[PDB]
Amino acid sequence: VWGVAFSPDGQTIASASDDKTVKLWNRNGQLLQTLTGHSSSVWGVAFSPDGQTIASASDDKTVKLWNRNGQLLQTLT
Amino acid sequence: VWGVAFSPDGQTIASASDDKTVKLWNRNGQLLQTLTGHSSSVWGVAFSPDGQTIASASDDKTVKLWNRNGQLLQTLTG
Amino acid sequence: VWGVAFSPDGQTIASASDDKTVKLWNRNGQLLQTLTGHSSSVWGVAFSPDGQTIASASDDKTVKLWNRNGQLLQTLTG
Amino acid sequence: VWGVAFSPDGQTIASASDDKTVKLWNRNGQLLQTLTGHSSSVWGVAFSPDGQTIASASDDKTVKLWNRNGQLLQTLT
C-alpha cells in the first residue's frame, strides 16, 4: 500500500483523494473511475499482481477490494 | 499506515487490528488467522518473498515472525 | 511517509522536498533532476514498472506524471 | 519504503527502531547490525533488488544508503 500507485502494466494510476474516494486515471489524463464507499479518509491504495483488483485502506479501519471496472468486491473489517 | 500488507501473489491480506492482533484474510473476504501475542499497538506488517512468513512490528519494541498457518516462530528484540 | 520511493531496478531514488519539488537521485548520491510545478506540499511519489515515469501526489489536489528526464507529461485532476 | 521489510532472499529482516536506528536481524533471531547516523526518528526502510544495499528514511529529512555489512554509503539531503 502506498497513497499513489501505477498498475503493473503502467497504463492506470490510482490515488487516494481528499474526499474519501480513490481515483483511477489512464496515463493520458482521462479519469476512469471514482471508488466511493469508505466512511473516512483513504490513505493507501494497491494493485493486485494481474492489475485486475484494487485494494484501498482507510481511517474507517477497513480494507476494501474493488474490480478495476469500479465494482466493490469485499470489505475486510 | 504500515499496518496493512498484501502477499506477493495477491492471495493473502494482513491487517493490524486495534486489539493488538494481526488478521490474515484471503482475497475472497474470509478470515484465515488471528495472530495474538504483541502487548502494545501493532504498527507494521510485512510478508516474506514467498508469502509464507509474516513479520509484525509493535510499540512493545519487538518484531514477531509468524508462519501463515498462525504459528509464532521468533520474537526479535533490538 | 509516501514521500520517498525507489525505482524497481534500485538505480534511482525519488524524494519530496519541503520546497514543493521532487528530487531524483542516482544510488551514487548524485542529484539528477528537480521536478518543479506543484503549488502545495508533495506527499507521495511512485515509479512506473520500468522506472521511466514518476508520479507525484500533492495537497494541491493534483497528481503529476513526469518522465525521468525531468519533462512534465500530465496533470491529473479528480 | 515500509517501517519493516524482508530482504529479497527472506533471510534478513530490517526494522525502524524507536531510538533513531535501523536494526537488521537474521530470520533465526540473531541481531546482525544496528545502523546509527540519523538525527531524528527513522520511519522507513527498504532493500535494493539484490539485497546488498539498505535505504532508510527519517524525520531529519534525509535518506541514507547503507551496505548490509553496516557501512554508511550515501546521505541524500
Author numbering:
A (entry chain B), D (entry chain B): 6 to 82
B (entry chain A), C (entry chain A): 6 to 83
Please quote the paper that reports this structure.
Instead, we used glutaraldehyde crosslinking to assay the oligomerization state of the assemblies, and confirmed tetramerization for the 2-bladed construct. As we anticipated from their oligomeric states, the 2-bladed and 4-bladed fragments formed 8-bladed propellers and the 3-bladed fragment a 9-bladed propeller. Instead, the packing of the blades within each fragment preserves the geometry of the 7-bladed parent, and the tension due to the mismatch between the number of blades in the assembly versus that in the parent accumulates at the interface between the fragments. In the two 8-bladed propellers, the one formed by four 2-bladed fragments absorbs the symmetry mismatch to different extent at the four interfaces, leading to a slightly oval shape and an approximate two-fold symmetry.
Many folds, spanning all levels of complexity (fibrous, solenoid, toroid, and globular), clearly originated in this way. β-Propellers offer an attractive model system to study this process. They are toroids formed by sequential supersecondary structure units of typically 40–50 residues, each consisting of four anti-parallel β-strands. The units are arranged radially, with their strands perpendicular to the plane of the toroid, and have a right-handed twist, hence the name ‘propeller’ for the fold and ‘blades’ for the repetitive units. Since none of our single-bladed PkwA constructs were folded, we turned our attention to another highly symmetric β-propeller of the WD40 family, found in the C-terminal part of Npun_R6612 from the multicellular cyanobacterium Nostoc punctiforme PCC 73102 and referred to henceforth as WRAP (WD40-family Recently Amplified Propeller; ACC84870.1). WRAP, which we identified during a systematic bioinformatic survey of β-propellers, was particularly interesting in that its 14 blades are practically identical, having acquired only 10 point mutations over 563 residues (6 of these being Trp → Arg mutations at the same position of blades 1, 3, 6, 10, 12, and 13), as a result of 13 non-synonymous substitutions at the DNA level.
